[model samples]
Target chain A: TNRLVLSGTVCRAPLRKVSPSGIPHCQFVLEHRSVQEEAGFHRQAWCQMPVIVAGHENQAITHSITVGSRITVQGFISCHKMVLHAEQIEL
Target chain B: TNRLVLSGTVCRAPLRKVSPSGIPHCQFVLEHRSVQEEAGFHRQAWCQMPVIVAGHENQAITHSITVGSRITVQGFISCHKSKMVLHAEQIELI
Candidate 1:
């Protein structure tokens, strides 16, 4: 089982594209900043995560997403450069 | 809110270390395999995640972990150089 849920700001403009198989995709970068507790101590954490929203079903909601948009993304990360495959997006 | 829950096999030997401040540390690598969905398609996923468990309390439970151990790790990841490090909050053998 693998799942990662992250809340961050869209730092880059979303780019829309389609694969050779005609699957729609929306790619963007998210900047995350939060205080996470580790070993009983609070530590500041940051991440610049690459996120991709695929499938025509998910593309409809992506139209409202833009740079500077704050959102929560839930998905699994692919090993290829740790890109997040967006299954659920919440604003 | 950043949290990652992964179940994988320990592919590397555990390294026990201590920081200058006397904080205990346990480091290891996990080999993960799963089929993840993307773009309405099934995609095979693999990751070799480096995990660091810090704190004296956490060390007690990690000492028994070895290579080939199957476990589920609950943690948070943060940017470290070109990769992300999994700071384990809890590790459970399965």
Candidate 2:
């Protein structure tokens, strides 16, 4: 049961659409703010990556998301070509 | 109760060291290849981030990680300013 659970604010607008088969899907990215481990640390970072979700009708598809909205995302930390990415995290 | 599970290949070598307090630590990153989802997807992706671990002197710390090695990582999906990352994931208990 290896899994990752994260929470942050919505960095971009949520994208929602339907496939030819009419399956509802929504994808969005969550941005977490870096916390200072100690005083006098000077390094700010952001995780602006895209994540997609499909093949589920029970999920809220018509919802809206905006920048600075706090949310939690859970999914696998995937990698491709040295770039870090994620998909299927709940908005 | 909320968590995510994933498996992938280690994209880089693992770094191991001990803190000034005599506690052991290790950190590394894992890479996953793109699998054909609906067939012929052009956009390739990866999850390259820095992870850290410390304390637990009883737990094995002086371990090794190599490129192309497969592993399973389980943790919370934390994000800071839209940058998703992981902290602690085991690499084959020894």
Candidate 3:
């Protein structure tokens, strides 16, 4: 299993466009800030994660959200590109 | 919360080195292949993830690990470099 679950605020506007295959695609940045304990030490974690909402879900994301919206996303990481392939998104 | 959980085979030998700050560091690539459902469709997912094991944990990893080893890792994603900042919380050989 390879899974990434994140909760953060949208830092950028979702850009919706059509792919060359005619499928809808949306891309955005999510700013996540939290505190985590690692190796017996506490640290503040802040990351600007890139997220991709593609296929049929792109339309739903485009219609329901905008910048600064807080959401939780469950997805798989495309490690090569370091992008999240959002499978389930909640507002 | 930002969390990443992955299980895969180590694709390369773990490289151990010491940082300028005297902390031990290890880096390796993990190949993950699995099937996931997205948008109501099932598809095969594969990724070559880079993992960083730093500080005191690096010593344990360098001593116990090897190539082609199957392991499960739980960590946080350091998005800027596209790297997984492994928390050393759990590294189970399975």
Candidate 4:
């Protein structure tokens, strides 16, 4: 019952890769920022996303995302061995 | 993959129910608002969520949600029969 919220910029275009299962994956870094309630400055964090683009081959990128374009992602927080990742949401 | 993002106020607290499997199901309606790319007062949609709360019985409501408190929910939009529901993400982080 853990919930994680992240909002940030695209940082960079997705670096395309292929997984062993023949899934075309898109990896990209997201720089998330959150302002404290009594804020003076915002705290920033960086995370990477490995998006499955294989099964979704026919689906085009719905929005034109580029570096600095803002986006918000929400999903289940997961740990594969020791690497932290979110299970869903692309761009 | 199609994505539907919804942000709104929870109309009511979850109505607890026990399914045939004895699984706890929590349901509530969400009133969402959105403005199109070219907009006026923004379009509105009201949907219900039948959340699977059976496996999770120990986690308390992290945040106290009430009427007028803003919330964002994101998930896969689905229609079973004729009702629309989201598959996950209680809050979409809008």
- Enumerate the candidates' DockQ scores in order: 0.77, 0.29, 0.51, 0.03
Q: Candidate 1: where is the Cα deviation over 4 Å?
A: none
> Tens-digit lDDT track for model 1 on B1-94?
8999988999997898888988899899998999987766799988999999998877887877899999889988888667788889988888
lDDT, candidate 3, A1-91, per-residue tens: 7788999999998887786887677888888888886545677777787887875645776567788899988888765456778877888
Q: Score candidate 4 by TM-score against the native.
A: 0.38
**Could you give the CAPRI-style class of model 1?**
medium
C-alpha lDDT of residue B72 in model 3: 79
Provide fnat values for all models in the order shown. 0.76, 0.41, 0.56, 0.00
DockQ of predicted model 4: 0.03
- Candidate 2 chain A: minimum summed lDDT over ten consecutive residues — where? A36-45
Off by over 4 Å in 3: A55-58, B17-25, B54-62, B80-84
Comparing 2 and 4 on lDDT, the stronger one: 2
lDDT of 3 at B61: 53
Candidate 4, superposed: residue stretches over 4 Å from native = A1-91, B20-22, B39-59, B90-94
Candidate 1 vs candidate 2: the TM-score winner is 1
Tens digits of per-residue lDDT, candidate 1, A1-91, equal 8899999999998899887987678999989899998767899888999988886677767888889999999998878778888899998
Residue-level lDDT tens digits of model 2 in B1-94: 2244556677766777776876576666766444423112334334565555444642363254567666666543444544455555343431
lDDT by residue (tens digit), candidate 4, B1-94 = 3233556667766566665766444555555433321112222223333332222431134135555555565443333443444433345322
Q: Candidates' lDDT values, in order?
A: 0.87, 0.50, 0.75, 0.41
Considering only chain B, report the TM-score of each candidate against the true chain B: 0.91, 0.60, 0.80, 0.59
